[PDB]
Design a protein around this ligand. Sequence first.
Ligand SMILES: Nc1ncnc2c1ncn2[C@@H]1O[C@H](COP(=O)(O)OP(=O)(O)NP(=O)(O)O)[C@@H](O)[C@H]1O
Ligand SMILES: Nc1ncnc2c1ncn2[C@@H]1O[C@H](COP(=O)(O)OP(=O)(O)NP(=O)(O)O)[C@@H](O)[C@H]1O
Ligand SMILES: [Mg+2]
Ligand SMILES: [Mg+2]
Lengths: 375, 375
Amino acid sequence: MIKNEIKILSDIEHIKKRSGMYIGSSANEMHERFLFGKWESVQYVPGLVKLIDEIIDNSVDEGIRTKFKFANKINVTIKNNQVTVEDNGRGIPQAMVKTPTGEEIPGPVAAWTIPKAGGNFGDDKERVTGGMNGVGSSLTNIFSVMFVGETGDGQNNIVVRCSNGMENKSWETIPGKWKGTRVTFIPDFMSFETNELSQVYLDITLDRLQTLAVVYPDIQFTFNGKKVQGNFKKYARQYDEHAIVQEQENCSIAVGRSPDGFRQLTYVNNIHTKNGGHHIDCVMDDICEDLIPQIKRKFKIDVTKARVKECLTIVMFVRDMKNMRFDSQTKERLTSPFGEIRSHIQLDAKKISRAILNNEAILMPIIEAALARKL
Amino acid sequence: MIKNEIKILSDIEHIKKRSGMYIGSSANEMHERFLFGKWESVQYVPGLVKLIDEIIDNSVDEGIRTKFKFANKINVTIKNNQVTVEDNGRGIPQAMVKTPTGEEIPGPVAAWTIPKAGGNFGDDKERVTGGMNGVGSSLTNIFSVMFVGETGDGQNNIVVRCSNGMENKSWETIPGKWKGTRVTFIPDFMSFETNELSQVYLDITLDRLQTLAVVYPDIQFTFNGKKVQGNFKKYARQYDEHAIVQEQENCSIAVGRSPDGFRQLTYVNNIHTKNGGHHIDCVMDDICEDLIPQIKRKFKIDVTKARVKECLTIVMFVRDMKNMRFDSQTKERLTSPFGEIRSHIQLDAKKISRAILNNEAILMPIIEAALARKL
Ligand SMILES: Nc1ncnc2c1ncn2[C@@H]1O[C@H](COP(=O)(O)OP(=O)(O)NP(=O)(O)O)[C@@H](O)[C@H]1O
Ligand SMILES: Nc1ncnc2c1ncn2[C@@H]1O[C@H](COP(=O)(O)OP(=O)(O)NP(=O)(O)O)[C@@H](O)[C@H]1O
Ligand SMILES: [Mg+2]
Ligand SMILES: [Mg+2]
């Protein structure tokens, strides 16, 4: 007898109880990843990072929605454990919405306090925003001791003041000409194996904002008062001095050395696919299938597709993909159809193949054991 | 202007609309993975596979709950697109449950038709069942054109007859001495890029049941009338004739060659962590940190931790872990704290290190390029 008693859970309850299917690990652990081009190994709690990224994602969504005519200044601030994200998008439409449970609640209130409530539930094939599930804001709110969202459309502002894991919710409206979005929160450090939003979280969010600045040059980000600049070839050279780049229509990619296994920083629209997934798998495949031809052809050697890739760092931004799909709320693994991906990425792997064959620093580790095993 | 209109979605709606955060890809695609020890590359739609695995997981959960005194025969059948899973656990307690939306609904009805309803919402630190979220059954039901669950506790049976994505639900009860669980369903092939539960799905589910038979020798599985047998050393040798095994308290692990990058089949209780995650990362680390000592010590060579692992296949079952945690409903990535993992796996990496140094077939590819680069 382990009891098998059936119980039913509210959305908020379920978010609290199965938090890691919603935001990730609470534990303060050591992960390997990229910071400023360096494959370091650093200690953070992944869920805390997500709490920030949700609010950022939302602003960058609005920039996307309006082709950067709106939300082209995004101001991020991290000061004594308080995260502030301000943008100049159009604000959250203040119109009201009806929940099936009778109630009648202002637009932004539901956006921020009701899971399964957002503005990315349209025709999937046309959805270009990184946002889609309608939950990430409520996640930051549910895991915040204080959460305060301010939007205004140019007419009036609504403030939604939330405390203690969104069990205190209140909202007021006052007229105003301001038009944009501000969100401020303090994480609930009881759901996390830290008690401080210490310096590493500052490093990550800057690093994220640097990467967002190169995907999205029409947005001027600022972190803690300092504007974030961006030049893609400059960015890429942070990962390997001896890197090489190619930029297409819906694509910017860079290839460089790795000392210790395939590494990849890889973006799909405004989303960091830290676990890779289909897009990077497919382009590494199309890459390797011109390379191993030429390499076995230029040198008569056999090297494996794992050998090629266990020596590359890759950086790839895919812009403007419709209806992108993932296997988790954490959007860490692009899971869209291989065919539709390959339709968007117009990858000239031929190009990319010849330039990697003409870059000794990059080419040599691939074929090295193979050449030394030939004699 | 892309419109930013806020909308609210029911649980079922959200499952339908964001299905891939719940079950995975609908697309009929080519994935690399293990079947019967062979790293083949085969074509399936991952979500369809999940629809089966949910119902299986549930029976194996009950076997776990009752230390295999119940649910030690589990009968799986796949015939003309109809999946049947029968077990002899205690049945789903027929008592009633109250939803916050007023209603009063029999235990098994909610289990199978209400998301966020199950019997794995107890004290997390004591939860040993692979089940935890209370949604997988409703997922099979939501993505089934016909779903029919039968349980009885020894007193009576309830039948819950569901059709067309769980928009037709009905249930009846009749007394009976039968005590166990039967679930039968036909997938809704409109949410998937196939129209047939063709032979590959048979191959996968047998392969899964073979793997479950070696983790759980106290359960006699049968697939389509044929009982599934199990001997761990026999299983392991399917992945590499020249494999090697070690079996501890909460651990069975096997190590063998790989021709093309780190491969791993890896189980945590009754769950296939196809994406690996923490447990395999941590034990590969503890493995490599005695190996690279001895290897640089037995041969004065430097090989990388990616080099070691890019040559291993690993098979690892971790049994009996409390409160295991993942980053998605698909339970594909064990995400529990590195410390708690290492507490459960009492890994004698020392042992495992010396035996891999004493197995030429396994040792030689690691150090090979390194030795040939030494002269
Ligand atoms: N900065 C912003 N500018 C404009 N609208 C916003 C902003 N932040 C939130 N919103 C609105 O509030 C809604 C709340 O959605 P949210 O709960 O964050 O999930 P989502 O962004 O829609 N998808 P996801 O975060 O991936 O689960 C959004 O869909 C927008 O309509
Ligand atoms: N074969 C079975 N034997 C006993 N009880 C069962 C069986 N199948 C379902 N149940 C019960 O029905 C509930 C429904 O849960 P379900 O919707 O499948 O999600 P879950 O198994 O609890 N967790 P998860 O599948 O990971 O989301 C279970 O928690 C059990 O209490
Ligand atoms: Mg968001
Ligand atoms: Mg289940």
